[PDB]
Design a binder for this molecule. Structure first.
Ligand SMILES: Nc1nc2c(ncn2[C@@H]2O[C@H](COP(=O)(O)OP(=O)(O)O)[C@@H](O)[C@H]2O)c(=O)[nH]1
Ligand SMILES: [Mg+2]
Length: 448
């Protein structure tokens, strides 16, 4: 019937997003069936019902979708694919904000990322239990526990919340509590949360269900064509190169013929194995993985197959069924990469760019297009000496354009030394915006 929605959690360090995730993950004693998958964890709808029971006191409950899928992996893997395709990787985003700290640098970074991404999101106001002399009711709804609290506590909460709402107003986005908010489009919804007590978690889950079911009912339907995107390319012993992928829709089976985007060219291979993590320590001891002859959306799965090393993160994966043309499909999957590649001119004066994923590369090229800096070549995966040579060619005619913009990429020591001696400039940042700031700083420092 319906397709399970995908949730992603992003916040400044020590906000409690991991702890919150663990609280939601917590085994329910009554339900159950929550499985840790590769790059994600899945919650069956019954477990959510069990967790969202108290929300019956304030809101109408709907449980149409089979489950909720959230992404465990730290960072921004949920945005490794193109923004148009982005809906597949992340239906809704959870921005965790410490009610104590309020807005922080990584928070503003994440906000800007979401605005560029045009991705819908809600904010979780975590650490509310830390409010002075807060009396906690484990796993209670927010409004109930708030009503339970003393006037002093309510006033402290109101002060901090008002401050944070003001800070969000500074970033240009209007914010309101989820029940108070009239329109989701204009106002972002705040749900106060405590990852330790579990307070607000029912509100959060209910809100996710509401937004995803109502707004994304349109977005999430069942499709017989496969829908999947590669979160990561990782090397696992006994399998060589494997790809960790989120299967948003459809069925994947062993022995399937699949085509995926690759740096040099399109990759075609047959699935040798479909793998999921194994919870039981005793069984995990024999083998770290469980094999599935067939796998059904929505879940995060590790795919083992030939020629996976060339694979690019963020790329969509297509299965050629009978009556389908594999070559046509290769062009189809490659279309995003080619689409980005064309924007760069192999012939002309430009800078060199290297990125980890398609989405990061997209954001980079968008930034350069805005700043009007031309790009001669595009790079994916680890930086090598040749990639630096590409920039080295620019040195004779234009010293200023002989630079490398690299995001979330690993640079070889040989490449590092070569660039060091040659005088090429390499920009590398964990955060995409850090690279923007440092780069503009470099341009203005060369401008003087
Ligand atoms: N009191 C309280 N502490 C929290 C809450 N959420 C997180 N913490 C604390 O914050 C510390 C670090 O949080 P962590 O989950 O590692 O943040 P993350 O790495 O950004 O996900 C942990 O030791 C938690 O005890 C909360 O809701 N209430
Ligand atoms: Mg963490």
């Amino acid at each position: 019937d319906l397709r399970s929605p995908i949730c992603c959690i992003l916040g400044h360090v020590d906000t409690g997003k991991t702890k919150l995730l663990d609280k939601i993950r917590q085994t329910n004693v009554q339900a159950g069936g929550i499985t840790q998958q590769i790059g994600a964890t899945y919650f069956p709808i019954d477990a959510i019902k069990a967790k969202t029971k108290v929300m019956a006191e304030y809101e109408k409950q709907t449980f149409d979708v089979p489950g909720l899928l959230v992404i465990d992996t730290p960072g921004h893997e949920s945005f490794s694919n193109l923004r148009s395709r982005g809906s597949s990787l992340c239906n809704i985003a959870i921005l965790v904000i410490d009610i104590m700290h309020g807005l922080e640098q990584q928070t503003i970074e994440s906000i800007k990322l979401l605005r560029d991404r045009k991705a819908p999101f809600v904010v979780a106001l975590n650490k509310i239990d830390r409010l002075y002399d807060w009396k906690a009711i484990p796993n209670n709804s927010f409004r109930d526990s708030f009503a339970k609290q003393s006037r002093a506590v309510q006033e402290e909460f109101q002060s901090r919340y008002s401050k944070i709402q003001l800070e969000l107003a500074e970033q240009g986005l209007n914010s309101e509590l989820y029940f108070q908010n009239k329109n989701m489009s204009k106002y972002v919804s705040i749900v106060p949360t405590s990852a330790v007590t579990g307070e607000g978690v029912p509100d959060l889950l209910w809100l996710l269900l509401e937004l995803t079911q109502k707004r994304m009912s349109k977005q999430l339907m069942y499709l017989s064509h496969v829908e999947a995107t590669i979160l990561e390319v990782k090397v696992v012993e006994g399998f060589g190169t494997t790809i960790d992928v989120i299967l948003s829709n459809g069925y994947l089976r062993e022995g399937d013929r699949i085509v995926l985007c690759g740096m040099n060219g399109p990759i075609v291979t047959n699935i040798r194995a479909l793998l999921t993590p194994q919870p039981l320590r005793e069984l995990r001891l024999k083998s770290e993985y469980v094999h599935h002859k067939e796998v059904k959306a929505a879940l995060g799965v590790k795919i083992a197959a030939n020629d996976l090393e060339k694979a690019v993160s963020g790329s969509r994966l297509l299965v050629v069924g009978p009556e389908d043309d594999e070559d046509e499909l290769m062009d189809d999957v490659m279309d995003d990469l080619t689409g980005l590649l064309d924007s760069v001119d192999t012939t002309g004066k430009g800078v060199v760019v290297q990125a980890s994923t398609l989405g990061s590369l997209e954001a980079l090229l968008d930034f350069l297009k805005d700043m009007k800096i031309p790009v001669m070549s595009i790079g994916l995966g680890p930086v090598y000496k040749r990639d630096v040579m590409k920039a080295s060619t620019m040195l004779e005619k234009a010293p200023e354009y002989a630079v490398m913009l690299c995001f979330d990429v690993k640079v070889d020591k040989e490449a590092e030394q070569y660039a060091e001696q040659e005088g090429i400039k390499i920009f590398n940042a964990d955060v995409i915006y850090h690279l923007f700031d440092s780069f503009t700083a470099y341009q203005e420092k060369l401008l003087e």
